[PDB]
């Protein structure tokens, strides 16, 4: 079975910086991309970024340009975000999703097909 | 926030039918690109629902149907029940701004 | 009086891989070339031995047409007389070709975020192409002097490569989109024209 587990959400003052990761397991790690996707309390879901199944390719949102980095390791099945300057909008419930097998018409269609748990990140003080 | 268009909130009850109406600018699903709904428990993590237009995936009841004409896109519940007080996402993608886009989400309540 | 089926291969969802082009064959219907040239959305159209605009009276026995997907920087090695990785072991024309050929960007269909990998094209081969073939064998290449079976460790290189293809990229990298005409305007009675 399709299963992700993820850690390293916690409460941190303003400034600071993070990093957190989530584990796969049960399929090979190795040929699917992955996805991070944040939801805000009250709001929908909202995309981050994206790494692709080598590492050498990759794309980040515009709001969190600069700020967020991600690796992959791929022997270990763990890929990591890192977060550099939090700001007071980053509070959400933090997902990392798979890519889409299949996606029959055209090719820039994507979609996600097994979900994590997420972790609780805020940001106070 | 939020591209996509969507109703805040659908009421029903037991027996009929209810519809939930995405709809897009002319970049996001005007261009030609399909249109995905997920399904999110309260206090669950969400789940796909209706991947592509209708193509139903594995391990999913009938009821749910959907389709998707000119730049909008709607969902289908028949022989409503109980067990569907959830929320519901339209999801996207937009070829302007490059990134994947969500719905702003409707919750179906039951009466 | 049947229209002549140009839509199937235009607006077709996916193109082929450049190493496996697909061809297909048009006979009978009535070409109109004058919609295709007055499109004005693609970036090059050049015909070879025959004028665009006289298109429209002259026929033929049969067209030929087959499609593909390459680079935006190796648009120019489609022509005849001109080396490359492309042209040498890919796709070839020969040096009396007469037809046309017409691309167009196509960034918005064929690349997606974090790239996308199902374009590939062949990078390793031991002879050029004769004009108009193909070779879909994906047996290990044999580079250097120890000879090697079923193993990619060292001198030995899988032939195909995959293009990465994101949206980010810049114009010389972006997809572009190639189809092909080709005329025989010999002999038989004529089939193609209107
Ligand atoms: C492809 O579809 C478009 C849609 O309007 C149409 O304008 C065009 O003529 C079609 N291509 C061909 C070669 O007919």
């Not at chain 1, 889409?100 to 805020?122: E, H, K, R």
């Not at chain 3, 108009?132 to 000879?147: C, L, N």
């Amino acid at each position: 079975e399709v299963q992700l587990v993820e850690s390293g959400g916690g409460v941190v003052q303003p400034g600071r910086s993070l990093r957190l990761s989530c584990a796969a397991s049960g399929f090979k790690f190795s040929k699917f991309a992955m996805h991070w996707v944040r939801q805000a309390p009250g709001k929908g879901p909202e995309w981050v970024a994206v790494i692709s199944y080598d590492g050498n390719q990759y794309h980040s949102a515009d709001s969190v340009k600069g700020r967020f980095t991600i690796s992959r390791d791929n022997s270990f099945n763990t890929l990591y975000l890192q977060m550099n300057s939090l700001g007071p909008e980053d509070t959400a419930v933090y997902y990392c999703a798979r890519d889409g097998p299949d996606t029959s018409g055209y090719y820039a269609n994507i979609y996600f097909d097994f979900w994590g748990q997420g972790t609780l990140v805020t940001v106070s003080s | 926030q939020s591209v996509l268009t969507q109703p805040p909130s659908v009421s029903g009850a037991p027996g009929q039918r209810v519809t939930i109406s995405c709809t897009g600018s002319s970049s996001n699903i005007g261009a030609g690109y399909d249109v995905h709904w997920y399904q999110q428990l309260p206090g669950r993590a969400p789940k796909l629902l209706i991947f592509d237009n209708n193509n139903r995936p594995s391990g999913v009841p009938d009821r749910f149907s959907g389709s998707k004409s000119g730049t909008s896109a709607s969902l289908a519940i028949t022989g409503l029940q109980t067990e569907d007080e959830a929320y519901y996402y339209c999801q996207s993608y937009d070829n302007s701004l490059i990134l994947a886009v969500f719905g702003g989400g409707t919750k179906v309540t039951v009466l | 009086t049947n229209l002549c089926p140009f839509g199937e291969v235009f607006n077709a969802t996916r193109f082929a891989s450049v190493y496996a082009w697909n061809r297909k064959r048009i006979s009978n219907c009535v070409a109109d070339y004058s919609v295709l040239y007055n499109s004005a959305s693609f970036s090059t159209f050049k015909c070879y031995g025959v004028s665009p605009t006289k298109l429209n009276d002259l026929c033929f026995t049969n067209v030929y047409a087959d499609s593909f997907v390459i680079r935006g920087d190796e648009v120019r090695q489609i022509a005849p007389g001109q080396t490359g990785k492309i042209a040498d072991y890919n796709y070839k024309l020969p040096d009396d070709f007469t037809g046309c050929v017409i691309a167009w960007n196509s960034n918005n269909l064929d690349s997606k975020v974090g790239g996308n990998y199902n374009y590939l094209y062949r990078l390793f081969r031991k002879s050029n192409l004769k004009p108009f073939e193909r070779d879909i064998s994906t047996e290990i290449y044999q580079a250097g002097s120890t000879p090697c079976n079923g193993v990619e460790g060292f001198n030995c290189y899988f032939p195909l490569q995959s293009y990465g293809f994101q949206p980010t990229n810049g114009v010389g990298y972006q997809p572009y989109r190639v189809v092909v005409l080709s005329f025989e305007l010999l002999h038989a009675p004529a089939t193609v024209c209107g």
